Amino acid sequence: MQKKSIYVAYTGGTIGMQRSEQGYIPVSGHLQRQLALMPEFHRPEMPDFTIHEYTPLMDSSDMTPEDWQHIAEDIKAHYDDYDGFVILHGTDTMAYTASALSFMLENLGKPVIVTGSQIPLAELRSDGQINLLNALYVAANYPINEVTLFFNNRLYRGNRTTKAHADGFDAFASPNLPPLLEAGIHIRRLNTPPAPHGEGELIVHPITPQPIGVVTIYPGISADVVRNFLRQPVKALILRSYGVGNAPQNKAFLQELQEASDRGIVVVNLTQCMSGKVNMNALAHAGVIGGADMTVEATLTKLHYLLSQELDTETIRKAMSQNLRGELTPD
Amino acid sequence: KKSIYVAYTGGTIGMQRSEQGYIPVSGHLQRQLALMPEFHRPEMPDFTIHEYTPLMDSSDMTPEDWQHIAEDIKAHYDDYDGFVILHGTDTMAYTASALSFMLENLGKPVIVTGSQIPLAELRSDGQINLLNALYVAANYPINEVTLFFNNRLYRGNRTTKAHADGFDAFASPNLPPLLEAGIHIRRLNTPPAPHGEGELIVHPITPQPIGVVTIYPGISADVVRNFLRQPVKALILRSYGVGNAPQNKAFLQELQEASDRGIVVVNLTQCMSGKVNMNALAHAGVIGGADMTVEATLTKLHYLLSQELDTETIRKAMSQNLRGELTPD
Amino acid sequence: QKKSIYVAYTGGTIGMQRSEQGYIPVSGHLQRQLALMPEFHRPEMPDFTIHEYTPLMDSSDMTPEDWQHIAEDIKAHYDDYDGFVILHGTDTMAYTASALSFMLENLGKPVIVTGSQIPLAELRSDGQINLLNALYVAANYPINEVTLFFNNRLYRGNRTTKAHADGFDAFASPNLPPLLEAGIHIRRLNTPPAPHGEGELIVHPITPQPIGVVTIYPGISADVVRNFLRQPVKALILRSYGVGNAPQNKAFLQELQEASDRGIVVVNLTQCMSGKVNMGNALAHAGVIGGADMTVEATLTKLHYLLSQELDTETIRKAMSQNLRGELTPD
Amino acid sequence: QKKSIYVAYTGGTIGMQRSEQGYIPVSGHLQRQLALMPEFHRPEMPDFTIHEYTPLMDSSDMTPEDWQHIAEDIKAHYDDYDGFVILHGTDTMAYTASALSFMLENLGKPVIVTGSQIPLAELRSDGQINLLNALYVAANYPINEVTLFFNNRLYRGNRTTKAHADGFDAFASPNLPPLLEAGIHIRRLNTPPAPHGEGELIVHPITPQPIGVVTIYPGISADVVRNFLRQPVKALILRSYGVGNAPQNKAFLQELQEASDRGIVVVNLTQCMSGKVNMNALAHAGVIGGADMTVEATLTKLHYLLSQELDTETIRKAMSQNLRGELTPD
C-alpha cells in the first residue's frame, strides 16, 4: 500500500557535487534536483524519501562531537515521522560518526544507515548512485534497528567499522565482526547476532567534546612521555599495545598509569593488531581496563558518550568493558 | 657449505613446557636442534647459535636491545654468509624495521623470525620457520633485513604484526613479499631496496622521546599541546584517509609552535594501507610519511635522531626512501 | 562526433520480462526499457543500435549455426560501427565468445560478449550494469579482441568458462588474468594482447562438427573408448589426469593410435581446474596432441573452426598446439 | 599403550629415492627413513605399521581391481588397528577415496587417503607433513569416514577432486567445507557427519564397469551421442550447462530416451566448477539429476551400484540419494 518514507540527511561528502571548470564543487540542492530526474529512485519498489541538506555541508575531517550532536538532534526531531534514516557523510570520519550515534541512540527501533561515496552522483559510473539507492532500499525493505554503515556493497554494524583505505579508492572494514547484510545480486541478511537493546521508547543521549588521549606503545617508550599524555585536562587515555595487550614491564611506565587511574583517569587498552581482542596482566594491575576487540573509533566515541553523561569513574570503567551496543565480543 | 649465524634473542620459539605453561630455558633451543636430524643434512648450511643472556620477552625490548643485535651482526659479519635473528613476535616488526636503518650497504641476508609454538612441540611452526630461514639465508640471499612468517619473506621495514589473538600473523600492507616459501621457494619480482656500493656501515641507535598519537574529531589543542611538551623530540600523527586533519586554528597553532621548537612532526594514515598525500598540516610544518608503517616511522625517527643530524636534514630524510620503507612519488 | 556501438541482442535473461511463471522473452522489451533509462543517453555514452534476433535464443539451445549467424551480423555491420556488444544467455556464452575469436581474424574493433542473471529492467539488475559498462568500454577502452564481460571484469573470450550457475552466475578465466577491470575507475591491465596480423578483417565460416569430449577414469575400457572414436567423429578431446597422464594398457593406447591412423585428431586436456598439460610419452606416442592450458570451450570451438576450413589433418594437429588467438600459453 | 595405525603404501612419490636419473621407487625406503625420524616416534604420535605394495601402483594406471585390493587390505586388518592411512599417487587419489567411501559401509574407524608431491627423503617435503598429520589425526581426531588429506585440510573423500597439478598439486572439495583443518591448531569443523548405518563393517565388492563420461556442447550430434551409448555401455554421465541445461532438439533427446529405455543409467552433472544441477527436457528423457556430485563420486558410485546385484530402478533411485555424504539433498 502506501510506501515507506525515508529521511535522508545530506550532512556532507561528495555525493551532491557538480562539475565546474575549477573542478567538483558543492552546489546547494544539486543532489535533490538530480534525484528528481532519475526514474530508478521513483520505482514502486523504492521508498518515498525527503532530503535535508545541511547548510553548509560538513567537511568530515573537520567535524567535532558538536556535529555528532547536531545529527542526532536531526534524527530525534524527525524520528516519529519516518520509517528509517539515511545519513550521507564524507568518508574520512564516517566510522566515527556511525560509532558515536550507536551509543547516543538507545532503544533504537528504526534503521539508521550512514553512507557516502567516493564519486559524486552526477558522474556516469558513480558509487554514489549505488550506495544511495541501496541504502534507501535496505532501510525500507531489510530494516535492522541499529546504526549501520553501508559501503563496498556491505552493511556493517556502525560501531565495528573503520576506514581501511583512501589512497586511490575508499574502503571500509569491520575487522572483528561479519557484516549484518550483504548487498549483492540478492540482498542477504547474515546470521550475525543482533546488538543488545532495551524494550522501551527511543532515548537520545547528549554528547560533548572530551579530552581523550589515543596513543601507541613502542619499545622503550619513556615514563616521561607517558606522563605528558596524562596531564590535565585529560580524562581518559586509550593505549594501543602489542598483540593480545602486552606492554613493557618497567615500573616507571606502570606507575604513571597507576597514578593516572588513582586520580580518576580512565585508561583503556586496545591491540595494535589489525584485528583480534586484548586478553589482559601487568597493565591490568595498574588500573588499565581491557577494551576487548573494540575498534579505536568505537572506544573513542564510547568514552565520549560515557563521559558526557552523569556517571562516576568506576561506572565508566565497568561500562567500557561491557557490550553496550554490539561494539565488542564478550568473553 | 654456507654458514649462517643465528642470534637467539628470546621468544616463544625457544621456550619449553612446565607446570606453569611455557617458560624460557637457557640451552633448550640448542639442545633440541642438536637432536633434530633435518637441521644437519647435506642440503642445510652449517650454523652457529648465539643465545642471548638474559633471554628477552620481546614486549620488554628497548632500542638498547636493537643496538645489541646490530653489534652482534657487526662483530660476526665477515665470518658468515647470512644471519637469522630469532625473536618474540610481539615486537619483531619493530626490531626488523630498526635494523634496516642501522645497517647501511648490507651485502648479506639478515632474516628476523620466530613462532607462536615452541620449536620442541609436535607440529611446531618454529621448526618450519627456522629451517626455512636458514635455508633461504644460505640459498636465496636477499641483501636486506627481512621478516619471515606465514611462509613468506617480507621486507622488514614494511611489516606489522596483523593478528595475535588465537594465532599470530604478520602483514606487509604496502608491498608484496620479497620471496614465498611454498613447495618450491620462489623469489618475487619485488624491486630491491635502494643501497650504496661501499662496505657495510653500522649506525648506533638509542631510545628517543617520541610521541605516536591518533587524531579524532574535536581533538583539543590543550591535549595536543601536552603531546608536544619536553622531552618530546618528534611526534607521529595518525590522521584521516590521505592525511587529512582538523583545520581549527588552535590545533594547527600547537603543531606550528612545536616545529618552531625543532620538533619533527610526521603524518601517517589511520588506514590499514595506502599513502598520505600532503595542505593545512603542511603549512604548520608537518612532514608527510607517505605509506610508511608505524614501526618503520618510529624506528626511522629513532635512527635519524640518534645520528648527528640537524632538524632540517631529519625532516628531509623522513620523506625519502632510505631503505625501501616507503613508495616514492 | 560520438562513438557508435552495434548491439546484437541474440537472447538471454538480460532482455527478458519478469512474470508469474518466471522470466520470459518479450519482443521489443529491451529496446522499450532502454529508451526510458536516461543514463544510456548521456553525453558520455556512445550512440548505439539494437538488433534483436528473431527468434530470441535460449543459449542452451544454440549450435554452431548460430555462431555463424552472429559472425555474419558482425561482418555485415563492421564498417558502420566503432565496436560491438553481443547480448547472450550465460549458459553457453563462453562457447560463443571462444568461437567468434577464431572466426574473426585481424579484428580491429572491440567485440564484447555479455549478459546477466537478472533482466535489465529490474531494480538493482546486473543487466543494467553489464550493458552500460560494455557499451562504455567498447567505445572508450577499445581492446581489439572478442572479450567477455561479467562480474565487473573484461576477460579474453577464449580463456573463459562459466564457473557457477546455482543461485548465482559467475565466469572465470582460470589461466589468464582479465584484460580490463571495471571498478570505480576502469583499468586496463598489462595482460599481453592476443597475436594478430596486420591486414583487413577476415571472417571465417563455421559449421557443426562431430567431436567427442570425454573424461578418462580408472579402468576405462578399450571397448568404450572405441565407441567414442567411431564415425562420424573427426576429433576427440580427452580430459586426462593432472599434467596429462592416462592408463597405459595396450588396448587403450591401441584404440587411440588407430584413431590417429584414421585421421582423427585427438587432443589432451587436464581434468584440473587450471594449469597446463605437459606431454607422459605414451599418449604422445599414440598420436595425441597436447592442448596446453586451453579451456574445454576454446579447444572445442578451435576444432570446429579448423575442421570447418577443410585443412589437412597434419595442419589441424599443428594448429591445435599453436597460440592462434591468445587462447593458449605457449611453452 | 599408544593407538596403532595401519599404513598402506600403495603408490606415489612419498617413499622414492634420489638417483642420477630422478625419483625412483626403492623397496623399503619409506620404512627405513621413518625409523630415523624421531618426530614420528614421539609420545604424542601413534604406533604404526607400514604395508608397502609390491609393486607400487602408478595411480594413473589404476583400475577398480586396485580399489578392491586396497579395500580387502583394510578389511583384513580392520580389527587389529585403530585407524588407517592410505598413501597414494595424486593423479587418481580422489577416485580411490571416493570409491572406498561407497565400498566401505558402517565404517567405524578413520581411513585417511593422502600422498605428496615431494618424496619424504627431500629436505622440504610435503610428504613429511602429510604423513605426520595423517597419522596424528587418524589417532587423535578420528572421523569415521574415508577422507582425503592434502593442502593441510582433511576433506570428505567423495567430495574431492584434484584441482591443480602443473607446478604444484592441489585438491579441492568444491561443494562442501573440509571436515577438519590442520593449521597451527588442529580444528574439526562443524561440517555435518556423513550418513551411516548401525551394524558392523560391510565391505562391498567392486569391478570395472562400462561407463561413458562426456561433456555436452553446442550442436552436439545425435550420431555422436548414439555412439557414446553403444554396447557395452551401462551408464553415461553427462556434464551439461549451468544448472543442468542441455539442447532440446528431439534427435538428441531421443537418443537419451532410447538409451534409458534399454536400461542405461544416464546421470546429469554440471560443467560448472561448483554447484548443483536442478532438474525439464532431460528429466522427461529419463535422465537422473546428480545434484552437486563430483565426477569422481558419480563415476565411482556407479561402479559401486552396478557391481552389486541390483535392479536398474534401484540403481537410478540410489544415484540421486545421499549414500555416503557425497551429495547435498534438496
Could you give the topology of this structure?
Four copies of one chain form a homotetramer.
Chain A: E1 5-10, E2 18-20, E3 23-25, H1 30-35, E4 48-53, H2 65-78, E5 84-88, H3 94-104, E6 105-106, E7 112-115, H4 127-141, E8 147-151, E9 154-157, E10 162-165, E11 171-173, E12 181-183, E13 187-189, E14 203-204, E15 212-216, H5 223-229, E16 236-241, H6 251-262, E17 266-271, E18 289-290, H7 296-307, H8 313-320
Parallel strand pairs in A: 1-4, 1-5, 5-7, 7-8, 15-16, 16-17, 17-18
Antiparallel strand pairs in A: 2-3, 6-14, 8-9, 9-12, 10-11, 12-13
Helix pairs in contact in A: 2-3, 3-7, 5-6
Could you explain the architecture of this structure?
4 copies of one chain form a homotetramer. Chain A is 26% helix and 22% strand. Chain A starts with a strand and ends in an 11-residue tail after the last helix. In chain A, strand 15 (212-216), helix 5 and strand 16 (236-241) form a beta-alpha-beta unit. In chain A, the strands form 5 sheets. The first copy, chain A, has an 8-stranded mixed beta sheet, sandwiched between helices. A 4-stranded parallel beta sheet of chain A has the order 15-16-17-18, sandwiched between helices. In chain A, helix 2 crosses helix 3 (94-104), helix 3 packs across helix 7 and helix 5 (223-229) packs parallel to helix 6. The longest helix of chain A has 15 residues, at 127-141. The radius of gyration of chain A is 21 Å and the shape is elongated. The first copy, chain A, is α/β, with parallel strands linked by helices. Chain A has helices spanning 30-35, 65-78, 94-104, 127-141, 223-229, 251-262, 296-307, 313-320, and strands at 5-10, 18-20, 23-25, 48-53, 84-88, 105-106, 112-115, 147-151, 154-157, 162-165, 171-173, 181-183, 187-189, 203-204, 212-216, 236-241, 266-271, 289-290. The first copy, chain A, has 2 domains: 1-208, L-asparaginase, N-terminal domain (Rossmann fold); 209-331, Rossmann fold (3-Layer(aba) Sandwich), CATH 3.40.50. Chains C and D meet through helix 2, strand 10, strand 15 and helix 5 of C and helix 2, strand 10, strand 15 and helix 5 of D. Chain A: It catalyses: L-asparagine + H2O = L-aspartate + NH4(+). Chain A: It is found in: Cytoplasm. Chain A: Its EC number is 3.5.1.1.
